[PDB]
Design a protein around this ligand. Structure first.
Ligand SMILES: [Cl-]
Ligand SMILES: [Mg+2]
Ligand SMILES: [Mg+2]
Ligand SMILES: [Mg+2]
Length: 155
């Protein structure tokens, strides 16, 4: 499950529309919001894990989205020492998806273990200043990499 360095291989998902917005989801039973992210299971490609977690967490099919971009290397963050439960952080590949189906297709309850209560569209800049602190450096990098593509859709 975990590599030699203590990092869990993980995929993260930025879903956008053609209005310069991204999909912002509220953590189940909490007050904090984030992008979907999920662990890569043994034997999966990153893209496979992404589509699995896409449905598990957001209820979307491959058929509902198109992949616009992905990050070319692993982005890493470490967990706060207090939050460590061995896994000391995640190494993430991030995907940029455009939602092409209707907003109504997003469903947080297709799986037996929902991770989000629900969602809303937010302005492109919003996530970097709103995500939990220990993910902010990764988020800054991700949004910088995806920025030109999302803006192109909104032009
Ligand atoms: Cl549209
Ligand atoms: Mg998750
Ligand atoms: Mg998940
Ligand atoms: Mg998972």
């Amino acid at each position: 499950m975990i590599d030699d360095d203590g990092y869990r291989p993980n995929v993260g998902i930025v879903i956008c529309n053609r209005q310069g917005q991204v999909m912002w989801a509220r953590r189940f039973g909490q007050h904090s919001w984030q992008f979907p992210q999920g662990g890569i299971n043994p034997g999966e490609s990153a893209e496979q894990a992404m589509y699995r977690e896409l449905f598990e967490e957001v209820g979307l099919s491959r058929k509902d989205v198109r992949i616009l971009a992905s990050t070319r290397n692993w982005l890493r963050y470490k967990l706060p020492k207090r939050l460590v439960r061995v896994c000391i952080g995640q190494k993430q590949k991030w995907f940029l998806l455009q939602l092409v189906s209707g907003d109504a297709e997003i469903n947080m309850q297709t799986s037996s273990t929902p991770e989000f209560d629900g969602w809303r569209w937010v302005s492109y800049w919003y996530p970097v200043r709103q995500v939990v602190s220990f993910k902010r450096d990764v988020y800054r990098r991700v949004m910088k990499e995806f920025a030109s593509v999302v803006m192109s859709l909104a032009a």
